[PDB]
Motif scaffolding. Structure first.
Motif, PDB file in Angstrom:
ATOM      1  N   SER A 110       0.832  -1.205   0.000  1.00 43.10           N
ATOM      2  CA  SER A 110       0.000   0.000   0.000  1.00 43.10           C
ATOM      3  C   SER A 110       0.870   1.260   0.000  1.00 43.10           C
ATOM      4  O   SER A 110       0.958   1.996   0.982  1.00 43.10           O
ATOM      5  N   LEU A 156     -12.343  -5.376   5.767  1.00 41.96           N
ATOM      6  CA  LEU A 156     -12.432  -6.018   4.461  1.00 41.96           C
ATOM      7  C   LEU A 156     -13.760  -5.700   3.785  1.00 41.96           C
ATOM      8  O   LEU A 156     -13.803  -5.438   2.577  1.00 41.96           O
ATOM      9  N   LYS A 188     -13.562  -2.327   2.340  1.00 43.29           N
ATOM     10  CA  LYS A 188     -12.755  -2.325   1.121  1.00 43.29           C
ATOM     11  C   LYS A 188     -13.562  -2.817  -0.079  1.00 43.29           C
ATOM     12  O   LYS A 188     -13.529  -2.212  -1.162  1.00 43.29           O
ATOM     13  N   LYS A 189     -14.290  -3.923   0.090  1.00 42.48           N
ATOM     14  CA  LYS A 189     -15.128  -4.403  -1.008  1.00 42.48           C
ATOM     15  C   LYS A 189     -16.254  -3.424  -1.320  1.00 42.48           C
ATOM     16  O   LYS A 189     -16.670  -3.312  -2.479  1.00 42.48           O
ATOM     17  N   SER A 203     -15.898  -0.171  -1.153  1.00 39.81           N
ATOM     18  CA  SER A 203     -15.236   0.831  -1.982  1.00 39.81           C
ATOM     19  C   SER A 203     -15.088   0.336  -3.414  1.00 39.81           C
ATOM     20  O   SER A 203     -15.343   1.083  -4.368  1.00 39.81           O
TER      21      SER A 203
END
Lengths: 83, 45, 119, 217, 146, 99
Positions: free
Chosen positions: C57, F34, F37-38, F40
RNA sequence: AGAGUGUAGCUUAAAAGCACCCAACUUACACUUAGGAGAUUCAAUUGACGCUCUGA
């Protein structure tokens, strides 16, 4: 008594009309970055860099050293991508 | 295109509990209303 | 030596010998130590493959700490350990930059360079 | 300039029901309700449960459950309106209520002496009237009912080159408010069709170039 | 200096048109500029109202982000106070007595400056496509005093 | 005169000891991260898809105006101009259970 | 059936910067903080995959 500018004026390029349709600098950092990237432009007026010690830098310098090693950038980038 | 504004959160810092209640309309249509006092239907006359 | 005193109405101040300048791009983070005259001496960027291949990242806080530590090492190898850092208020409040200067100090670089003798 | 006077119109239908829920989306609903549960404070039924139980225990040493159970009884007694009005029919492609989850476009079938085309409802613009007026007049003639198909804008939609004497087609749009259909068994093959069945129905390029302005959802 | 080629380099108030107008009570409304071949509208108001404050606010945020990304001007957005509707519940057996339940109604207002023909019909069709659940929409004219 | 409703009732100040606890687990926290994130990913994909549809059909309407100007020199002004019919425009949202 | 061709949305970039989206603050927007997904169509400068316009 007037004298025309010896080149483009700094703010002439942007449009003066329809200023509502122009996006504004919503922050301080974007204006700051534009200002710093403009500071090194070759302006036709007198500037700090013209006076403060650059030893007339622009002139090609003679390279005396080994040639760079020939590498296959395609395969190297592919390997880095796999990594 | 309706799965965009259906996702919601309450941004008020202090707020009482809300519960998903099936609000029936005058033509028999259900709406998921975030209502306290966890009822299940509010039939409006 | 003489520091460039003044300008006293603009930002940032030019009164230093070496400045720590951090550019925080979207995909990357880089930091440089440059002399007042303009030429950079050391820099650590997440673009550089040596640390890009390892870290994760490239925009992360841990990425900027890795940047700070590696440039602390290479600036100590350069022999420079005194330099100033002038942030904006939000940059100074940024946890990434706080841990960055922490990484600097534990790397052994002291900010706030000393003052001129017979200024 | 010989140009053959022809426009066209597409019928849009607003959905009545929402789409299936993505299972990541349902996990998201669960997690956001977790956050709401954690950060909620001072709930009326919460203290009418907790403090009421505490005071009942105190007086025992000397409501809420009833309401919850009779509201659960209300939930069990009142079954909701059936979502699936599509699988039970499976065959009334001409019906309005055949599909409510998506937007549907109407098309009419007629066979010419030269052309064999499944066409979107065409129109014939007389030069003495505006294109929007011609579109709504043709809409009335082809619909032969009472349609409150409110329009959106005077600007057109599409134009596909066909020449045999040049010719053009000028697509327009109109939003339907509510539909009552007289002569539900019209031999004129009108049909309510979504985007997928639309693409399945488009034989030529002229129809294949109509799927890009309709609501792809 | 005034006789030099670099005269007027520090000119900025021609860039910033903002003369600090008292824009809290002014009623200088832009009208619908209609040239026939070039149509543009004035201040048209949009009203989204619902029983659910969170979904109404989410809809308002979504349309605000969409319109800011669409590159048209947003003058001001605000909210109307909460409206409470009571449901007077008649009993099944004895209809004479009158019980009650409480309910709420929320609102928010977004305004738009520039509307071309294709652009505004496009915006309307997109916002009806993305219209959410339980929220009623109505676009009306400007004059709406609290 | 505006009427304000962005003020929390004064009854919300005292009773603030009901649920002050946040005792979570590393596993749940990583699951939430997580999921975000998914989320997004999904929202970026949705926005890109909507943008592509908008741009395609906008290019198409620009082509419509251009070819209308090219083919009919007098119809284009009326095609651009607004009829007042869309002044009291309003639409109702979707439902869950059909009548 | 012919022509133009070609790095994620954009770039006289050589795997970048703007862009784009998520969470926090902000009524909201905006600012900022903390996060995310990304591209040089293949085969030896040459040939054969994708797009566009022109057709039929």
């Amino acid at each position: 008594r007037r004298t025309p500018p010896l080149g483009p004026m700094p703010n002439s390029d942007i449009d003066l009309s329809n200023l509502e349709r122009l996006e504004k600098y919503r922050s301080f950092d974007r204006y700051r970055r534009r200002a710093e990237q403009e500071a090194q432009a070759p302006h036709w007026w007198r500037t700090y860099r013209e006076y403060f010690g650059e030893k007339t830098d622009p002139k090609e310098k003679i390279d005396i050293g080994l040639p760079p090693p020939k590498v296959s950038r395609t395969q190297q980038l592919l390997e880095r991508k796999q990594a | 295109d309706s799965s965009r504004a259906s996702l919601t959160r309450v941004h008020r810092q202090a707020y009482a509990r809300l519960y998903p209640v099936l609000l029936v309309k005058q033509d028999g249509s259900t709406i998921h209303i975030r209502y306290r006092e966890p009822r299940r239907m509010l039939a409006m006359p | 030596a003489r520091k460039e005193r003044g300008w006293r109405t603009v930002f940032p101040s030019r009164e230093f010998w070496h400045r720590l300048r951090v550019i925080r791009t979207q995909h990357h983070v880089e930091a440089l130590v440059e002399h007042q005259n303009g030429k950079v001496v050391v820099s650590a960027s997440t673009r550089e493959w040596a640390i890009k291949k390892h870290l994760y990242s490239t925009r992360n806080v841990v990425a900027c700490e890795s940047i700070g530590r590696v440039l602390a090492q290479r600036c100590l190898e350069a022999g420079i350990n005194f330099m100033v850092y002038q942030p904006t208020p939000w940059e100074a409040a940024s946890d990434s930059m706080k841990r960055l200067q922490s990484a600097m100090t534990e790397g052994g670089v002291v900010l706030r360079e000393p003052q001129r003798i017979y200024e | 300039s010989p140009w053959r006077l022809l426009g066209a119109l597409c019928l849009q239908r607003p959905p009545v029901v929402s789409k299936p829920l993505t299972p990541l989306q349902e996990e998201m609903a669960s997690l956001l309700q977790q956050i709401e549960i954690e950060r909620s404070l001072y709930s009326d039924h919460e203290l009418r449960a907790l403090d009421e139980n505490q005071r009942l225990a105190k007086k025992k040493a000397d409501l809420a459950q009833d309401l919850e159970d009779m509201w659960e009884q209300k939930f069990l007694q009142f079954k909701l309106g059936a979502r699936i009005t599509e699988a039970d029919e499976k065959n009334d492609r001409t019906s309005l209520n055949r599909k409510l989850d998506r937007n549907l476009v109407l098309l009419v079938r007629e066979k010419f002496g030269d052309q064999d085309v499944w066409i979107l409802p065409q129109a014939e613009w007389q030069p003495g009237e505006t294109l929007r007026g011609t579109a709504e007049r043709t809409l009335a003639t082809l619909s032969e009912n009472n349609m409150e198909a409110k329009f959106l804008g005077n600007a057109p939609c599409g134009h596909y080159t066909f020449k045999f004497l040049g010719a053009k087609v000028f697509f327009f749009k109109a939003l339907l408010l509510t539909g009552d259909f007289s002569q539900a068994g019209n031999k004129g093959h009108h049909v309510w069709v979504t985007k997928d069945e639309l693409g399945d129905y488009l034989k030529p390029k002229y129809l294949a170039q109509v799927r890009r302005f309709v609501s792809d959802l | 200096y005034k006789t030099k080629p670099t005269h007027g380099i520090g000119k900025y108030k021609h860039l910033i048109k903002a003369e600090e107008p008292k824009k809290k009570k002014g009623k200088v409304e832009v009208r619908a500029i209609n040239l026939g071949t070039d149509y543009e509208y004035g201040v048209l108001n949009i009203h989204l109202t619902a029983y659910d404050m969170t979904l109404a606010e989410s809809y308002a945020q979504y349309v605000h982000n969409l319109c800011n990304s669409l590159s048209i001007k947003v003058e001001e957005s605000y909210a109307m106070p909460t409206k409470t509707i009571e449901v007077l519940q008649l009993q099944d057996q004895g209809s004479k007595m009158l019980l009650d339940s409480v309910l709420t109604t929320h609102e928010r207002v977004v305004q738009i400056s520039g509307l071309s023909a294709t652009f505004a019909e496009i915006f309307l069709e997109i916002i009806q496509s993305s219209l959410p659940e339980g929220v009623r929409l109505s676009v009306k004219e400007h004059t709406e005093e609290d | 005169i505006p009427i304000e409703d962005f003020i929390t009732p004064l009854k919300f100040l005292d009773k603030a000891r009901e649920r002050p606890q946040v005792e979570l687990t590393f596993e749940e926290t990583e699951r939430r991260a997580l999921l975000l994130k998914k989320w997004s990913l999904y929202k970026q994909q949705e926005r890109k898809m909507e943008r592509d549809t908008i741009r395609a059909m906008l290019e198409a309407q620009q082509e419509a105006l251009e070819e209308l100007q090219l083919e009919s020199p007098k119809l284009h002004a009326e095609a651009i101009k607004r009829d007042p019919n869309l002044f009291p425009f309003e639409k109702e949202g979707p439902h869950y259970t059909p009548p």
